[PDB]
Design a protein around this ligand. Sequence first.
Ligand SMILES: Cc1cc2nc3c(=O)[nH]c(=O)nc-3n(C[C@H](O)[C@H](O)[C@H](O)COP(=O)(O)OP(=O)(O)OC[C@H]3O[C@@H](n4cnc5c(N)ncnc54)[C@H](O)[C@@H]3O)c2cc1C
Ligand SMILES: Cc1cc2nc3c(=O)[nH]c(=O)nc-3n(C[C@H](O)[C@H](O)[C@H](O)COP(=O)(O)OP(=O)(O)OC[C@H]3O[C@@H](n4cnc5c(N)ncnc54)[C@H](O)[C@@H]3O)c2cc1C
Lengths: 544, 532
Amino acid sequence: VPSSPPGGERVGILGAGIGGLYSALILQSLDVPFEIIEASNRVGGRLFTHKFPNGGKYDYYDVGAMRYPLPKSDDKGNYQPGVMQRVGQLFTYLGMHKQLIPYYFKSNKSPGFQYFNGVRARIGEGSSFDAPALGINSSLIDIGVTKIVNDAVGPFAQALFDDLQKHTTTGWDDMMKNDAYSTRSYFSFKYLPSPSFGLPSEHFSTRVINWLETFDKSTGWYDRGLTETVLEAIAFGEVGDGEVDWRCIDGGSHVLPDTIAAFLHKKGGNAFVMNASVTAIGLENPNKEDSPMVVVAGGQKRKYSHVISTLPLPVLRTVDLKNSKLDIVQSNALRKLQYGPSIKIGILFKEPWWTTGQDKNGEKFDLVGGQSYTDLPIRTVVYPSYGVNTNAPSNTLIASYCWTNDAERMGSLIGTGAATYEEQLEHLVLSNLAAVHNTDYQYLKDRLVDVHSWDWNHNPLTMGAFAFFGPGDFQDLYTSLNRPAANGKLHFAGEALSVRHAWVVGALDSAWRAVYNYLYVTDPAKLPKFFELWGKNAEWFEQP
Amino acid sequence: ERVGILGAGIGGLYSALILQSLDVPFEIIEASNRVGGRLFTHKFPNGGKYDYYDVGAMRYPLPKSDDKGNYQPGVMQRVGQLFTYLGMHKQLIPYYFKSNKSPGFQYFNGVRARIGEGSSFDAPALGINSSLIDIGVTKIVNDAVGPFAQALFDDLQKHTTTGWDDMMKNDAYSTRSYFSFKYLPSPSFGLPSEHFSTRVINWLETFDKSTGWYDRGLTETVLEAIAFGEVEVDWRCIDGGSHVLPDTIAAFLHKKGGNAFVMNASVTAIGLENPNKEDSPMVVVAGGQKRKYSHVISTLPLPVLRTVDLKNSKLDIVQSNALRKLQYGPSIKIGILFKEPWWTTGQDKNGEKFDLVGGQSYTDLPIRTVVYPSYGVNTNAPSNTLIASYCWTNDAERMGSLIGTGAATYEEQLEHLVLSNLAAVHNTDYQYLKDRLVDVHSWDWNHNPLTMGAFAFFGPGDFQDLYTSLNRPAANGKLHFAGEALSVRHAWVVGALDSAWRAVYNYLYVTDPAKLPKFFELWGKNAEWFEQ
Ligand SMILES: Cc1cc2nc3c(=O)[nH]c(=O)nc-3n(C[C@H](O)[C@H](O)[C@H](O)COP(=O)(O)OP(=O)(O)OC[C@H]3O[C@@H](n4cnc5c(N)ncnc54)[C@H](O)[C@@H]3O)c2cc1C
Ligand SMILES: Cc1cc2nc3c(=O)[nH]c(=O)nc-3n(C[C@H](O)[C@H](O)[C@H](O)COP(=O)(O)OP(=O)(O)OC[C@H]3O[C@@H](n4cnc5c(N)ncnc54)[C@H](O)[C@@H]3O)c2cc1C
């Protein structure tokens, strides 16, 4: 159904993701008419939860967002300052604080497994994983990958964390002076070990750098922007102050967009336009000063005063933006600003063998939540933290969670539609799970029930997992999209338009900035109420 | 004594030719029902003789040749000799890298021009100085890569390795980081003596190659400059599609010695029957049945080996990591069959004739590259098939998501996007092309379990740290790694030939060195070093 603009203002939100839904909450709280246009048959976008039909209450897994490193909170839903504060307040604003259950980043019982170079160990046993055979000095092994990488990113990350506390941008300025570096080129040409390590003051070799990447991140991560590596350290809480409180949503992250879709309806009506793929955006007349915006979605023209686009950048490259009058830098930013891939494989088993089972030698796994890591194709294993300590614990496992090259390669085995490749994938995954945990292949096969795989890099609605900028992207093209187009009536938003890529808070920040520019240009009288309800700044810290 | 060749690609078929010429028993194991691997030609069933297009290999920058199949020295000499060895010289028809008549189109930043008109494509609005625009991207990139390429080209002529040694000293650079931290423009350009900014570098990448290329190894950019002949080359393609090469080699093998192919057999495990016994054979679990061999030559792409069980192959720790870290690149192609060769005979919305015969058109729109058919021209039935899109790196990752969905709704979205971009690049109405469309065929090599990527595309440091590990054998010297990845001519057929040459060389060296003179005499004294 069509909406209605009291005062002549109707905002057209493109995309029913968390970014678009957040824009709706803000506009709805400010008595601004809006309309959400969604290409698919569902809302939530990359908050995608899959429920196995042959499972119980907690036999699901999040294909997209699953964990949230929130600041500490009281029992009433007030969150302390922090990177993810904006997310925590959104949960409280929707009455979801009681649904935020603990997420165990590390195993709540026995440590998770590490399996690299044929060497199997548990996290904390200080194993070398045969690094000496690779040529890694003995001094490096004793220091550790976590300690070395933290020393290189620390200075940058600390400066950005100071921007958030002290309300400055100098930290970003210094970061941008180094944005031309990839994480690799920074280690190869700039980084020098801290004197406290007792190492030679010299740059690392390729062998050492690839050794850092292996245990620190994913294959090919370090070839992308250094800026991304520092930002991901801040989001993960690797270099901050206040302790982080990992949380996930009871029932899957899909509860968040579902609750927001109900909140937006309880007041008035339904402002969603589903199954309508935006094919063109632009001013009705680019020369007229007060021309509205036209959004051709689902083959039907729709008029709006302003448009807030949460579409991922590769999708805008498929939309006709002729009459949107983007400048030459914004046009190029849509193409060059890089995205990253990712795949997830969820398997439903007959039992939570990882919690109660045992290996070939009788040793109990005793894993509750947490993760296991390996250099095998599956790279990462994530055990369910939801449903533990319940009548029906979860039988669902994330048998694979890959990034960058590991996701690009594995993706070819996903979504093929061929029976042969669905079985190859299953045998490969179980085989890697079998090696990582020290069990026979048949032990897991006898417990398999259903398999679900997803490749965000082959999804036409996202065209990539998330933004993952390469070197120089932030310093040359990011700013162009932070200002509007189409005579100020087209606002770019989405997780890509933020410094928290691959996080929900990034989508929220982009919506905040989009509404801020909208109110600033149409109804500045609402800025005080806007600041009071949604914050004075997107990112700079502030008390609840 | 019997060698097990894994993979019926051009690399495996070449290994078979060599072993067959040296009277060495072999057996080819192929997972699919076809031979040629990435030599993939698609024939539209509703088309004519030349209504096909090469999904993989399609063009070959061969050295100049006489009328009897003798090729002068050059990077692609080994390929030319293979065509002659198979009696295919008369089938090598011209390939037009540039339009054989009027130049191809360029469409960047909304500015449309023809190749050669020296358009700036509105670069001044991007901040590109007038001095850079006058010099040009081609002239700048050639100035930065020239030194490296010349040193490597001298290695091939003078038979040395000093050039490669110098290249490896700089392998830690990506092409981007080289411009940002080391490169200084030649004083002859009249530019400031300082490294290029990000804006300028992305401007170079936009017109020189594909989105995201410059984030990968500098070495790869230098090697691809040598393969393309940027150092004269005689571009050629195969009459009827590149599939003729593997098909012709399969016939050459079925007549002499009988058939020796094992099709529809997916290799799932490789290793010694007993890793402790000194003279243990190699076992290859293919199609669920064990097969014994004396030596195994694997042409499987590196990501595929990561899905094979190599427990009893006794790889060292560097080889294990090389399989994972050695990076591959993506690529997609979209071939469209039209009612007529409108690009050759049609006209735009303003009446101006396209007048395009062969060649290529370039744009910053999602399709990036358009390739017009050079095969079938000057025939009763010229080709009506167009390569509407040919992407690399990031352009392929994005487009790939719209390919292979299996859903009719999104296959039409893709078709509308492609035709719409073709409409803008050529200055025609969308309906002008739609009225002439007949069939569409798209392929995403980054979504294919038999390749798991288009080809090797190493990142910084891969050549200098991990490439060597896979060039030595495993499994007590009974497992030899081959394929285009194991070469310095990635994404080229000659690279697969070089890998096969080196694999056979090590095999003969360790089992029957008495055959090395015949091996050298028939297939060359070196994989890469030039010869007559
Ligand atoms: C594997 C993975 C794991 C993640 N894990 C976490 C985590 O643990 N914690 C966390 O905080 N974040 C996580 N994230 C990030 C989070 O999921 C995203 O950052 C956030 O959901 C992005 O929201 P958005 O609104 O910007 O984009 P999206 O959610 O992608 O929304 C875009 C919307 O636009 C629609 N659309 C697309 N094309 C069109 C079109 N042509 N016309 C109209 N509509 C269109 C889509 O269908 C979708 O509804 C993860 C992401 C991934 C990929
Ligand atoms: C888009 C594109 C364009 C190209 N264009 C050109 C060009 O213009 N000129 C040029 O010279 N080169 C070009 N190339 C390069 C050329 O096509 C390849 O370099 C060459 O064909 C690779 O041969 P190979 O034997 O190394 O691998 P492949 O041809 O991939 O052969 C591997 C074989 O192994 C099989 N196999 C896979 N998995 C298994 C398994 N588990 N068990 C058993 N068998 C298995 C495959 O089916 C295949 O038969 C191009 C490549 C691409 C992708």
